[PDB]
Amino acid sequence: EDERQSIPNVLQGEVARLDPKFLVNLDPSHCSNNGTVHLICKLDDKDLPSVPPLELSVPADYPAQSPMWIDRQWQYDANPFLQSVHRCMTSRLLQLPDKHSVTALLNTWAQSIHQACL
Amino acid sequence: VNLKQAILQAWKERWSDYQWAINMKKFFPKGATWDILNLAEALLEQAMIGPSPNPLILSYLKYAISSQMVSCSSVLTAISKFDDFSRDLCVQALLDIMDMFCDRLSCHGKAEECIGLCRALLSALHWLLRCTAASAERLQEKQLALCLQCLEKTLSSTKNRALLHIAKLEEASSWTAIEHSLLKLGEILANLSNPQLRSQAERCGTLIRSIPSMLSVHSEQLHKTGFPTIHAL
Amino acid sequence: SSSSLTSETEWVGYPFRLFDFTACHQSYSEMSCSYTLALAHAVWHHSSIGQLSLIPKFLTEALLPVVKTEFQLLYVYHLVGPFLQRFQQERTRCMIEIGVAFYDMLLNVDQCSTHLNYMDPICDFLYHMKYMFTGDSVKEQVEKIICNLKPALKLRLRFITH
């Protein structure tokens, strides 16, 4: 009795609940078992699109959250509007007490992206 | 063709530059087929801009291509035969906005289309050398140095090297033409009008003429040590 | 020590593999300088009672206008170094001499020298020379002598001067 063919199914059961407007894919293989998560997501919906987040969480023990923002250095400072989006997302994440793997991070990211339009 | 009228309306009714993509995806299934992408947007807007950069539109194109396709942009800016136009103004903003491609990255195609991206950069290189023709003003230049410096910005190693190598393995006619164009461009820029002129340009010329020769040229030297292998053999 | 050994000695310039002894384990790898260093180390270890006592002044008398290249410096290091603890045991009062002697050599290998390929070996060699044997003893004498070094040597020994 073993899965032996996928990641920890905890994050599977979590991501199965999220809205269909979030499209998660598979990045280069660096989050197979221990890290277990490469949250490469697209907000394919009626709202305006943006840069896919990284959001690399930790083992299912969750002594951490997802947001890591590696590819952000050039993805955010180039566009002023996207820079404001990043500022809003950071201010929201800092105000999130112990955010969680997929639900909290993606929800905060989407709400900041579609609130900071102005 | 209705996309053209939609963009013309978005200009007639100027937008918040973030609802831009909202209204754009509103007129299409937004995922069914993107073979009708911006491959006509920038060309149309700038050719009708003529002797003007047409502001408030390129910003929307940038906020789109922040997360959009890149092969089409490259093949357009390569096929944009601005040499006959040569307004020396539109190409300025064009290079200014295209520098981001070499700045951040040349994204993936997720399929064999990525290999086609190589082709694009190939033509881009050719198209880049076309700005050397713009160096033939002889008003006594101003934008030639800019085009050469952004060209150099494009030639950051370990990024385009293998891409242009695969491009050369695609066909040899285009690469031989690129070599002849580099020869002509060096012969033209031999008249060093400035200190950095014909110096960094020569560096880029040497780079592009040396890269397709070998990408793994191990220059390990002065590595003298115990060499008994051939001895014992 | 100055047979040709100045600029275009030969492609033999690789110092470590050949200048140190035991390299002539084969019938090859047998250079004259190697056997000379071996005879040296022999007479140095055997006569480490009173014959070595005249050695510091010797280096200050004759070894000054002969050091031109850097492998000459590595050679004279091979000659002097491994027997300094013998002085440290009883003849401490000349260690500083040896020290500044080496430091003087630096000056030479700073003047008639374009580039230094294996300089960091000499840097850390002198580093442990200072910290393991002399310590904060010869600071004042070396302060006025290391100020003439090359930028790389300064960047290496800015803690030695401290």
UniProtKB/Swiss-Prot annotation, chain A:
PTM comment text: Ubiquitinated by TRIM11, leading to proteasomal degradation.
Subcellular location(s) per record: Cytoplasm; Nucleus
The organism's place on the tree of life at top rank: Eukaryota
Record text on subunit structure and interactions: Component of the Mediator complex, which is composed of MED1, MED4, MED6, MED7, MED8, MED9, MED10, MED11, MED12, MED13, MED13L, MED14, MED15, MED16, MED17, MED18, MED19, MED20, MED21, MED22, MED23, MED24, MED25, MED26, MED27, MED29, MED30, MED31, CCNC, CDK8 and CDC2L6/CDK11. The MED12, MED13, CCNC and CDK8 subunits form a distinct module termed the CDK8 module. Mediator containing the CDK8 module is less active than Mediator lacking this module in supporting transcriptional activation.
Function: Component of the Mediator complex, a coactivator involved in the regulated transcription of nearly all RNA polymerase II-dependent genes. Mediator functions as a bridge to convey information from gene-specific regulatory proteins to the basal RNA polymerase II transcription machinery. Mediator is recruited to promoters by direct interactions with regulatory proteins and serves as a scaffold for the assembly of a functional preinitiation complex with RNA polymerase II and the general transcription factors. Required for cholesterol-dependent gene regulation.
Similarity comment: family membership: Belongs to the Mediator complex subunit 15 family.
Record's protein name: Mediator of RNA polymerase II transcription subunit 15
The encoding gene: Med15
Coverage span on the entire protein: 669 to 786 of 789
Swiss-Prot record, chain B:
Tissue: Expressed in the adrenal gland, brain, epididymis, heart, kidney, liver, ovary, pancreas, prostate, skeletal muscle, small intestine, spleen, stomach, testis and thymus.
GO BP: any one term: positive regulation of transcription elongation by RNA polymerase II
GO cellular component annotations of the record: core mediator complex; mediator complex; nucleoplasm; nucleus
Annotated localization: Nucleus
Motif (LXXLL motif 1): 125-129
One GO MF term: nuclear thyroid hormone receptor binding
Keywords: Activator, Nucleus, Phosphoprotein, Repeat, Transcription, Transcription regulation
Chief location category: nucleus
Domain of life: Eukaryota
Task performed by this protein: Component of the Mediator complex, a coactivator involved in the regulated transcription of nearly all RNA polymerase II-dependent genes. Mediator functions as a bridge to convey information from gene-specific regulatory proteins to the basal RNA polymerase II transcription machinery. Mediator is recruited to promoters by direct interactions with regulatory proteins and serves as a scaffold for the assembly of a functional preinitiation complex with RNA polymerase II and the general transcription factors. Required for basal and activator-dependent transcription.
Quaternary assembly: Component of the Mediator complex, which is composed of MED1, MED4, MED6, MED7, MED8, MED9, MED10, MED11, MED12, MED13, MED13L, MED14, MED15, MED16, MED17, MED18, MED19, MED20, MED21, MED22, MED23, MED24, MED25, MED26, MED27, MED29, MED30, MED31, CCNC, CDK8 and CDC2L6/CDK11. The MED12, MED13, CCNC and CDK8 subunits form a distinct module termed the CDK8 module. Mediator containing the CDK8 module is less active than Mediator lacking this module in supporting transcriptional activation.
Family: Belongs to the Mediator complex subunit 24 family.
Protein name stated in the entry: Mediator of RNA polymerase II transcription subunit 24
Boundaries of the shown chain within the full protein: 4 to 247 of 987
Curated annotation (Swiss-Prot), chain C:
Domain of life per record: Eukaryota
Compartments, as annotated in UniProt: Nucleus
Family affiliation: Belongs to the Mediator complex subunit 23 family.
Complex formation: Component of the Mediator complex, which is composed of MED1, MED4, MED6, MED7, MED8, MED9, MED10, MED11, MED12, MED13, MED13L, MED14, MED15, MED16, MED17, MED18, MED19, MED20, MED21, MED22, MED23, MED24, MED25, MED26, MED27, MED29, MED30, MED31, CCNC, CDK8 and CDC2L6/CDK11. The MED12, MED13, CCNC and CDK8 subunits form a distinct module termed the CDK8 module. Mediator containing the CDK8 module is less active than Mediator lacking this module in supporting transcriptional activation.
Function: Component of the Mediator complex, a coactivator involved in the regulated transcription of nearly all RNA polymerase II-dependent genes. Mediator functions as a bridge to convey information from gene-specific regulatory proteins to the basal RNA polymerase II transcription machinery. Mediator is recruited to promoters by direct interactions with regulatory proteins and serves as a scaffold for the assembly of a functional pre-initiation complex with RNA polymerase II and the general transcription factors.
Name of this chain's protein: Mediator of RNA polymerase II transcription subunit 23
UniProt source species: Mus musculus (Mouse)
